Design a protein around this ligand. Structure first.
Ligand SMILES: NC(=O)c1ccc[n+]([C@@H]2O[C@H](COP(=O)([O-])OP(=O)(O)OC[C@H]3O[C@@H](n4cnc5c(N)ncnc54)[C@H](OP(=O)(O)O)[C@@H]3O)[C@@H](O)[C@H]2O)c1
Ligand SMILES: O=C(O)Cc1ccccc1Nc1c(Cl)cccc1Cl
Ligand SMILES: O=C(O)Cc1ccccc1Nc1c(Cl)cccc1Cl
Ligand SMILES: O=C(O)Cc1ccccc1Nc1c(Cl)cccc1Cl
Ligand SMILES: O=C(O)Cc1ccccc1Nc1c(Cl)cccc1Cl
Ligand SMILES: [Cl-]
Ligand SMILES: [Cl-]
Length: 341
């Protein structure tokens, strides 16, 4: 009858100062074409703080719901939705407002899943971003050199593995030796701990002809190193720039004043990617990722905070700590929060 959810009550990139936990919210009811899903796991995404800052659509004022992805059980549904779905069914979804005990989701956008496991949730946003961007914009083929930044993170783990499956030589940046050991276990050809080894020098010395593709999630100084490291006809994919999101504008400073000259001289490109412009590819990407995940052909690493200071991310209240965990760069794999029941 009543539930908890997170609500953006003031616009800010500081998630804690933007987002309030409301305790006595009515449970929303599904319409004819809708599922009501009881969330068991929810995904934490770097851009949750871009969302809370109001950067997705600056015309929209608080209050609004938050959280982009969920997995759980159908506990109620509209009559039309009941032709494809049934009460008790395990479903996952990408839609705003997953940070709630219950979320209304139109049946048309639900993804049926084998059971309610956090591994499947890693595929929804993190997996599909890596898959679709690389398939559509990567031009991957055997022997290409691929550099992945935030490689041990939520989407990075997939960009790594998909590039390896495309028979590419893959370099991955991360911030610790434990993350480097994880990258290695995924088949990474050259893991780099950027805190202990200078990435620019590694690339100049070991990849003098440059890299063919960059999956670039970090921005700032890493973006700059990436541009310099591009091969002739190289492609830098701008997936994100997380080093900037906490700032007031959300941007990360770059020394890009000579970027056009660099790109002309190399016949190289900088290509942006936004998931929501490629939704026509989503179902097929999800289907392929799910098959690999269920068959054990894809590592879907989940970080539920079990080794964080206050331990497992349980409950909506832990989302605040989970966002901090990401922004301290502590996670290995996809950060997920559990709503126990
Ligand atoms: N374009 C799209 O449609 C789309 C969709 C989804 C996600 N993305 C992008 O994918 C990237 C990763 O998102 P995610 O949600 O999967 O997170 P994640 O990679 O699981 O976590 C972020 C990681 O980035 C590094 N990092 C954290 N804060 C940093 C900082 N202030 N400066 C530099 N590096 C920092 C850390 O790894 P290290 O150990 O490597 O430092 C941290 O583990 C983001 O840029 C996100 O916006 C884009
Ligand atoms: O907006 C909707 O109706 C749900 C929906 C469906 C498919 C893809 C994206 C979205 N929503 C959405 C939006 Cl509008 C912004 C940021 C993140 C997400 Cl998941
Ligand atoms: O199917 C399409 O035409 C693209 C599209 C546009 C808006 C919202 C969703 C979708 N596709 C879609 C579907 Cl059909 C199921 C699950 C997830 C997504 Cl993103
Ligand atoms: O470019 C290609 O065709 C290879 C390619 C690139 C990016 C993403 C996926 C794929 N292929 C691919 C496919 Cl189609 C399914 C499962 C795993 C992989 Cl690596
Ligand atoms: O994630 C990013 O870096 C880009 C971005 C910016 C603002 C709002 C959403 C998104 N990405 C995004 C989208 Cl477009 C759909 C579902 C889930 C996510 Cl995390
Ligand atoms: Cl649709
Ligand atoms: Cl760096």
């Amino acid at each position: 009858s009543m539930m908890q959810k997170l609500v953006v009550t003031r616009l800010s990139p500081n998630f804690r100062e933007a987002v309030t936990l409301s305790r006595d919210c009515p449970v929303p009811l599904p319409g004819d074409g809708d599922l009501l899903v009881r969330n068991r796991f929810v995904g934490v995404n770097a851009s949750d703080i871009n969302y809370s800052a109001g950067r997705y659509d600056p015309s929209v004022k608080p209050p609004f719901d938050i959280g982009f992805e969920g997995i759980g059980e159908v506990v109620a549904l509209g009559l039309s939705a009941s032709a494809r779905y049934t009460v008790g069914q395990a479903v996952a979804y990408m839609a705003p407002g997953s940070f709630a005990e219950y979320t209304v989701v139109p049946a048309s956008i639900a993804t049926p899943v084998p059971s309610v496991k956090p591994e499947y949730l890693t595929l929804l946003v993190s997996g599909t971003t890596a898959y679709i961007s690389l398939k559509e914009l990567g031009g991957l083929s055997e022997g290409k050199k691929v550099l992945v930044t935030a490689a041990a993170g939520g989407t990075g783990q997939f960009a790594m593995q998909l590039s390896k499956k495309a028979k590419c030589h893959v370099i991955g940046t991360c911030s610790s030796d434990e993350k480097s050991a994880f990258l290695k276990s995924l088949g990474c050809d050259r893991p780099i701990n950027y805190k202990t080894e200078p990435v620019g020098t590694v690339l100049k010395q070991e990849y003098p002809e440059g890299v063919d593709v960059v999956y670039e999630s970090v921005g700032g100084a890493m973006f700059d190193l990436a541009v310099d490291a591009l091969a002739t006809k190289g492609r830098l994919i701008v997936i994100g720039f997380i080093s900037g999101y906490q700032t007031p504008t959300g941007l990360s400073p770059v020394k890009a004043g000579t970027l056009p000259a660099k790109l002309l001289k190399k016949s190289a490109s900088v290509q942006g990617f936004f998931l929501n412009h490629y939704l026509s590819k989503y179902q097929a990407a999800m289907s392929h990722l799910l098959e690999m995940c269920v068959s054990g052909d894809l590592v879907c690493e989940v970080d539920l905070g079990d080794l964080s200071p206050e331990g497992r991310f349980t409950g909506l209240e832990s989302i605040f700590r989970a966002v901090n965990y990401m922004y301290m760069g502590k996670n290995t794999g996809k950060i997920v929060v559990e709503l126990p029941h």
